[PDB]
Design a protein around this ligand. Structure first.
Ligand SMILES: COC[C@H]1N(S(C)(=O)=O)[C@H]2CC[C@]1(O)CC2
Length: 284
């Protein structure tokens, strides 16, 4: 079926939970043996969220190459994404090592450091220009260059230096700051505006390594971001945009990381975002 009318048909019939459970039943199951090794327990935020072995990002290190991060490679859309958990106190150096080694331009953050009164990820970037951060375990230096605070999101320019080679690179930090502590946003308008700002920066384009996107577990809000982006790109590429099947795209993405889209409300929100986004692209 088309999307917008399949949407109204699920709303009127109140069957979002049944649709979402079907997705959960059909999703891929692949091994995640490296994630479960005892030496990696303090590298995982949640015991039930792990990268598959076949798609995990490897650190360029001979001691321990493990990070909780997955490469989502979308062949028809010609887009790739790295989805990862919010960094932990003992993985902030691994996080920036990955950004460096994978040649990423941008980092997309969809959570606040504290939500619901608890810590959802480490404070992994510097908050003042004159107070830079040094990660001694991976030999990197990170400096805040500039910050632009807007009503729904903040964009930061950061300098990452590989202290071993003295090479430097500019990284863009795109921080969506207004996702509610409970539920999903009422309108997708600010989330779509944010997606378009990431696109306009070059961070999603083939001349760079894959964008790094995270929330707390790296599957819920993060899944919503890449699912909406890929569906909108396919609607632009194809002769028949009504042929884009959001459930099929989500199942394809779940071949590369478990659990993408965590609730039926996140599934409904993803439909809403693609539907509204397709009107703004045109041609209107
Ligand atoms: C408690 O939520 C009810 C669910 N339905 S339903 C009846 O379609 O599954 C609507 C859409 C998703 C919800 O989780 C929120 C309202």
């Amino acid at each position: 079926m088309e999307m917008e009318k399949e949407f109204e048909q699920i709303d009127k019939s109140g069957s979002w939970a049944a649709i979402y459970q079907d997705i959960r039943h059909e999703a891929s199951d692949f091994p995640s043996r490296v994630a479960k090794l005892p030496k990696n327990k303090n590298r995982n935020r949640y015991r039930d969220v792990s990268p598959f072995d076949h798609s995990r990002i490897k650190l360029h290190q001979e001691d321990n190459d493990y990070i909780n991060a997955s490469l989502i490679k979308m062949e028809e859309a010609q887009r790739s994404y790295i989805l990862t958990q919010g960094p932990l106190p003992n993985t902030v150096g691994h996080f920036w090592e990955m950004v460096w080694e994978q040649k990423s331009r941008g980092v997309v953050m969809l959570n606040r450091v504290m939500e619901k009164g608890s810590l959802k990820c480490a404070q992994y970037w510097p908050q003042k220009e004159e107070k830079e951060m040094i990660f001694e375990d991976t030999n990197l230096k990170l400096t805040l260059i500039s910050e632009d605070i807007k009503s729904y999101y903040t964009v930061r320019q950061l300098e990452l230096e590989n202290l071993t080679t003295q090479e430097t690179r500019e990284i863009l930090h795109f921080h969506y700051t207004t996702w509610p502590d409970f539920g999903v946003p009422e309108s997708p308008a600010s989330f779509l505006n944010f997606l378009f700002k990431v696109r306009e920066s070059g961070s999603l384009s083939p001349e760079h390594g894959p964008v790094v996107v995270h929330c707390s577990a790296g599957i819920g809000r993060s899944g919503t971001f890449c699912l909406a982006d890929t569906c909108l790109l396919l609607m632009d590429k194809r002769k028949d945009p009504s042929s884009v099947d959001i459930k099929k795209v989500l199942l394809e993405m779940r071949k590369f990381r478990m659990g993408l889209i965590q609730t039926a409300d996140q599934l409904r929100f993803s439909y809403l975002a693609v539907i509204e986004g397709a009107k703004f692209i045109m041609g209107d």
